[PDB]
Amino acid sequence: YHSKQIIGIPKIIQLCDGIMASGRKAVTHAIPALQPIVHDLFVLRGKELETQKEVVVSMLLRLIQYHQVLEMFILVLQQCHKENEDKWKRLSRQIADIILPMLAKQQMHIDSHEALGVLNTLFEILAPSSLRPVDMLLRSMFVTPNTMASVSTVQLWISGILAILRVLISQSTEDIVLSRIQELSFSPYLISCTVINRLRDGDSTQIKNLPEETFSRFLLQLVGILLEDIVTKQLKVEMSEQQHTFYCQELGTLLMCLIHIFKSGMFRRITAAATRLFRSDGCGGSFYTLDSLNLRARSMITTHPALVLLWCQILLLVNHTDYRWWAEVQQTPK
Amino acid sequence: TKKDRVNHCLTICENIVAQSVRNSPEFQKLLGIAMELFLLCSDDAESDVRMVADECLNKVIKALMDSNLPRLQLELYKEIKKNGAPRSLRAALWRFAELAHLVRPQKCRPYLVNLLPCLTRTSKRPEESVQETLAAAVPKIMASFGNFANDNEIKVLLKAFIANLKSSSPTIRRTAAGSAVSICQHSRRTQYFYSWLLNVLLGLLVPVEDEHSTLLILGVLLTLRYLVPLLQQVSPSAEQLVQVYELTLHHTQHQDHNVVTGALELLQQLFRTPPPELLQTLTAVGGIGQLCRIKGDIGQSTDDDSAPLVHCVRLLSASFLLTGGKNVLVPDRDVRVSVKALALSCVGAAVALHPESFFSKLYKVPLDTTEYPEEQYVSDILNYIDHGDPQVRGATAILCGTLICSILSRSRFHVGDWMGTIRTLTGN
């Protein structure tokens, strides 16, 4: 205004700060206010600009549980990648040290296809050095939820596992992942069927097994959990219509991840252990057995043909050519 | 004088609109005279003079809405402030409520504070025409002024309409029921006031074994019917949401068909849009127990061996649809077609949630085997597809047209497996 400024950037941050520091919803008020701010400061713009940038980043960290903010951090990280390589590494480490504990405590709002998809690309955009020691990645994955009597908590718990699982099988190697699972005393009985039944009520309370045995046991239990509550859950009573389709989407990507592990050949030790575990009884009911898994999968034929075929592909990857399951899906005449 | 007044009103009515300068101070007074005259002219013996006064009163509003609304809202509020004739009060009330959403937030708290006594006083007007206009005005006023209200100001308005639930006039009762629910809906603490209103409504009738006025029961049940759809997501709890269900079930056995009709209408509303907290209780085996005449034992709502919806379906069929004999339609002189059609709607909605309730026997414990040698099932209600009136025939078609959808969905399209156990469990 003739050498006079009408409104300054710091005043705009303060106005956004007041909105986000009140009882208004962050999805409809705080996030839409931040979006033009971080797109202006970062995408298109030495001493004062940096301080505003760090203040905005600090505000984003307080709303990091929302996937809309996660996209904003992707934009910030992408811009930071080009300008200053060193700043990209430090920012990625700061984000990784925050979201990963939140994934363990189910504090991130990733209970949807869109939110989980956004979080997947954030992990790729992050600096590889922020996730190279997979000790923290594994520690936030091999966890248990507060309770499994709530559909949202189960989906949130599984959603966080899927995001970390994808990082392990893409940005790391089988040799690295299994070795750290050996050093960190992770047990296959973390989510065993005894624990599953306890958690489904709502209560929040051996031989030297190879790490590939516990990794395959952990993934197989989630398959049983998703299969159990996809068919034993009233649609209008227990879950919702959005919670039902996300259950199948969560199962679809989990079976997809299992197929890649077995098919690629980059996870030989995991596949060998998983093939052996599919052929073993559930240690006296402590773990889901293959017969129990097939019973829950046979029921989905009339409702979810897409997921049954994914389960059929997995059964071939572990050489389960028994006609007890194949003569029924194929409807072989007798 | 009749023809003069119509021409006199029109001449002023066109003078205001056809004036070029609308900002002159003399015009502001002139606007306050025409609006006052039209509202006074809205109360006339002749319909012609009343109709033209009404007709161009909103035409001067529409022309002046863009620029002179704050004065128009103020002028219309003065007529509401004074409790005058019903004709002049309704004319200024439905007009003001229409333009309430154009009031800027600055002049919202001052308007609401001044409007609190006006809405309370209007609730005491015995005229059915006034209560009809006030019924539609409250949701329009509260949708704009509600979020500017204090915690105890909502209570004052709520208690004003609650006292109108025992009135003899159905129009007064309906106005009170709709306004009270709408007041809670358009408030800052929407969920807190839903519990507060729900607790107050229950307290008016929670001693079911005591004596209550028929008018009071009709008013409270109507209020609960309006409140139920808004409870579908301090918050309303399972304990009080169950008490409403028990209150609804008990009043279906009332001797007055008006109370039965009101209870049945709320019962189907509880099933069309069931709150999630109540829905799990109704479909659980433990259910409530965890936390024309009925001749025999049908069970209890608090049974610990079957879902509460099983007993509800049994209660509806034994009371309004089925006798103890097979293929014996209940006579129309005992319970009318309206109750029969309403009962079948409730059964179909209940079946949509718990299809197993449709296949149960009518009576939990078989009655005397001499008078009724063969046991009758709830499925005999499908014989109403041949009823004499079209509403009961249509409700029966909807009833097990919904049963087809519910059985296939619940069974996950394994009908032989699902129907195999229901045939063994109930014998149907």
Q: Do B412 and A237 touch (CB under 8 A)?
A: no
Alpha helices in A105-206 (DSSP H): 113-125, 135-141, 151-171, 174-183, 193-201
Distance CA B318, CA A287 (A): 48
CB atoms within 10 A of CB B396: 23
Burial of A254 (0-12, 13-18, 19+ CB in 10 A): buried
Q: How many helices (H) and strands (E) does chain B have?
A: 17, 0
Which residue has tokens 């949701």?
Answer: B139
Alpha helices in B104-237 (DSSP H): 109-122, 128-145, 151-162, 170-185, 190-205, 214-230
Distance CA A46, CA B110 (A): 50
Look up residue B101 and give its two tokens.
């959403």
For B93-112, b where at least 16 C-beta lie within 10 A, e where not — what string? bbbbbebbeebeeeebeebb
Q: How many residues does chain A have?
A: 334
Look up residue B295 and give its two tokens.
């001749």
- Which three-class secondary structure state does DSSP give residue B348? helix
Distance CA A262, CA A129 (A): 27
Look up residue A72 and give its two tokens.
């904003």
Q: Do B353 and A302 touch (CB under 8 A)?
A: no
Experimental method, per PDB record = cryo-EM
Closest CA to B296 of B373, B381, B366: B366
- Would you state the torsion angle of the CA atoms of residues A307, A313, A319, A324, taken in this order, to the nearest 10 degrees? 50
Closest CA to B129 of B182, B91, B100: B91
CA distance B206 to chain A (A): 27
For A173-210, b where at least 16 C-beta lie within 10 A, e where not — what string? ebeebbebbeeeebebbebbbebbebbbeeeeeeeeee
Distance CA B424, CA B428 (A): 8
- Would you state the torsion angle of the CA atoms of residues B126, B127, B129, B135, taken in this order, to the nearest 10 degrees? -10
**Which distant-in-sequence residues (6+ apart) come within 8 Å of A36 by Cβ?**
none
Q: What is the DSSP letter of A145?
A: -
Alpha helices in A27-145 (DSSP H): 31-38, 49-62, 67-83, 85-104, 113-125, 135-141
Please check whether residue A274 is in contact with residue A218, taking contact to mean a CB–CB distance below 8 angstroms: no
Breaks (C-N over 2.5 A) in chain A follow: 45, 205
- Would you state the torsion angle of the CA atoms of residues B17, B23, B27, B29, taken in this order, to the nearest 10 degrees? 120
Q: How far is CA B43 from the centre of its chain?
A: 32
**Which distant-in-sequence residues (6+ apart) come within 8 Å of A181 by Cβ?**
A138, A142, A211, A214, A215
Look up residue A112 and give its two tokens.
């949807």
| Beta pairing partners, B329 | B322
- Contacts of range A319-323, beta carbons closer than 8 Å, 24 or more positions apart: A319/A275, A320/A278, A320/A279, A320/A290
The separation between the first and the last C-alpha atoms of chain B, rounded to the nearest angstrom, is 80
CA distance A221 to chain B (A): 23
Please check whether residue A219 is in contact with residue A227, taking contact to mean a CB–CB distance below 8 angstroms: no
Backbone phi, then psi, for B108, in 5-degree steps? -110, -55
Look up residue B416 and give its two tokens.
């032989």
Which residue has tokens 């000790």?
Answer: A135
- Which three-class secondary structure state does DSSP give residue A22? coil
Please check whether residue B76 is in contact with residue B99, taking contact to mean a CB–CB distance below 8 angstroms: yes
Burial of B228 (0-12, 13-18, 19+ CB in 10 A): buried
| Beta pairing partners, B377 | B361
Please check whether residue B73 is in contact with residue B99, taking contact to mean a CB–CB distance below 8 angstroms: yes
Q: How far is CA A313 from the centre of its chain?
A: 23
Sign of the CA dihedral with B339 first, then B340, B343, and B345 last: negative
Closest CA to B251 of B339, B333, B170: B339
Which among B283, B409, B412 has CB closest to A299?
B412
What's the farthest any 2 CA atoms get from each other in chain A?
Answer: 91
Cβ contacts (< 8 Å) between B283 and chain A: which residues?
A: 234, 237
Look up residue B180 and give its two tokens.
């009270």
Amino acid at A184: L
**Which distant-in-sequence residues (6+ apart) come within 8 Å of A198 by Cβ?**
A205
Which residue has tokens 């079946």?
Answer: B351
Closest CA to B71 of B137, B24, B14, B138: B24
Q: Provide the resolution (angstroms).
A: 2.6
Look up residue B402 and give its two tokens.
């919904």
Distance CA B382, CA B397 (A): 8
Closest CA to B172 of B224, B225, B124, B115: B124
CB atoms within 10 A of CB A324: 9
Backbone phi, then psi, for B322, in 5-degree steps? -125, 140
**Interface test with chain A among B412, B413, B414, B415, by most A beta carbons within 10 Å:** B412
Cβ contacts (< 8 Å) between B409 and chain A: which residues?
A: 235
For B182-213, b where at least 16 C-beta lie within 10 A, e where not — what string? bbbbbbeeeebbbbbbbebbbebbeeeeeeee
CA distance A302 to chain B (A): 6
Sign of the CA dihedral with A271 first, then A275, A280, and A284 last: positive
Which among B280, B353, B412 has CB closest to A302?
B412
Distance CA B404, CA B49 (A): 60
Please check whether residue B9 is in contact with residue B56, taking contact to mean a CB–CB distance below 8 angstroms: yes
Cβ contacts (< 8 Å) between B353 and chain A: which residues?
A: 236-237
| Beta pairing partners, B297 | B365
Closest CA to A161 of A211, A223, A77, A213: A223
Distance CA B166, CA A305 (A): 58
Burial of B43 (0-12, 13-18, 19+ CB in 10 A): middle
Look up residue B251 and give its two tokens.
């009043």
Look up residue A195 and give its two tokens.
């624990």
Please check whether residue B299 is in contact with residue B306, taking contact to mean a CB–CB distance below 8 angstroms: yes
Sign of the CA dihedral with B278 first, then B283, B289, and B292 last: positive
CB atoms within 10 A of CB B383: 15
Backbone phi, then psi, for B365, in 5-degree steps? -110, 125
Q: How far is CA B419 from CA B282, B402, B411, B423, in A?
A: 21, 16, 8, 6
- Which three-class secondary structure state does DSSP give residue B297? strand
- Which three-class secondary structure state does DSSP give residue A198? helix
Q: What is the DSSP letter of B377?
A: B
Q: Do A299 and B409 touch (CB under 8 A)?
A: no
Which residue has tokens 């009520």?
Answer: A201
CB atoms within 10 A of CB B386: 10
CA distance A300 to chain B (A): 8
Look up residue A240 and give its two tokens.
């919702």
CB atoms within 10 A of CB B234: 11
For B321-348, b where at least 16 C-beta lie within 10 A, e where not — what string? bbbbeeeebbeeeebeeebbbbbbbbbb
Distance CA B110, CA B325 (A): 67
| Beta pairing partners, B365 | B297
Q: Do A237 and B413 touch (CB under 8 A)?
A: no
Look up residue A97 and give its two tokens.
């040290």
Closest CA to B116 of B151, B68, B81: B81
Backbone phi, then psi, for B165, in 5-degree steps? -80, -15
Which among B280, B410, B414 has CB closest to A302?
B414
Backbone phi, then psi, for B361, in 5-degree steps? -70, 155
Closest CA to A140 of A108, A117, A109: A108
Q: In this complex, is the C-beta atom of A238 within 8 Å of any C-beta atom belonging to chain B?
A: yes
Look up residue A265 and give its two tokens.
């050949």
Please check whether residue A122 is in contact with residue A74, taking contact to mean a CB–CB distance below 8 angstroms: yes
User: Half-sphere exposure (CA, 13 Å, Cβ side) for B339?
Assistant: 27
For B277, nearest residue in chain A (alpha carbons): A237
- Which three-class secondary structure state does DSSP give residue B356? helix
Distance CA A68, CA A63 (A): 9
- Which three-class secondary structure state does DSSP give residue B51? helix
